[PDB]
Design a protein around this ligand. Structure first.
Ligand code: HEC
Ligand code: NA
Length: 88
């Protein structure tokens, strides 16, 4: 409901590793749609789960995102992925 809330969470907690849909730690484990889709992760729910609890080399951020923040940041990331991380 609040404009930008997911994007602001992304900047606060995720951009340091994932700005512009990349991954500065494991390059292949990026946030491009094809990369997420290959792993079955191209949904708000899957991304939210990773946001909350982490996966593999990544820790969780659910302790910092606020109630429902995992879903908010996930929805923003999915939109970006769908747009190939560029807008006009
Ligand atoms: C660097 C310290 C990171 C921060 C901050 C965040 N993530 Fe991350 N992410 C990181 C790594 C090293 C990996 C790969 C983990 C592995 O071993 O497989 C990931 C992965 C993701 C994914 C999956 C991407 C893929 O499989 O292609 C998602 C969806 C993801 N990360 C989301 C995400 C969010 C929402 C974050 C902020 C809440 C976040 N990450 C921060 C490293 C880092
Ligand atoms: Na685009």
């Amino acid at each position: 409901e609040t404009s930008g809330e997911g994007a602001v969470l992304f900047g606060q907690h995720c951009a340091g590793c994932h700005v512009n849909g990349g991954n500065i730690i494991r390059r292949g484990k990026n946030l491009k749609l094809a990369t997420l889709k290959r792993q079955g992760l191209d949904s708000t729910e899957a991304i939210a789960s990773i946001a909350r609890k982490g996966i593999g080399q990544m820790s969780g951020y659910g302790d910092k995102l606020g109630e429902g923040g995992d879903q908010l940041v996930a929805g923003w990331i999915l939109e970006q992925a769908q747009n190939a991380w560029t807008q006009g």
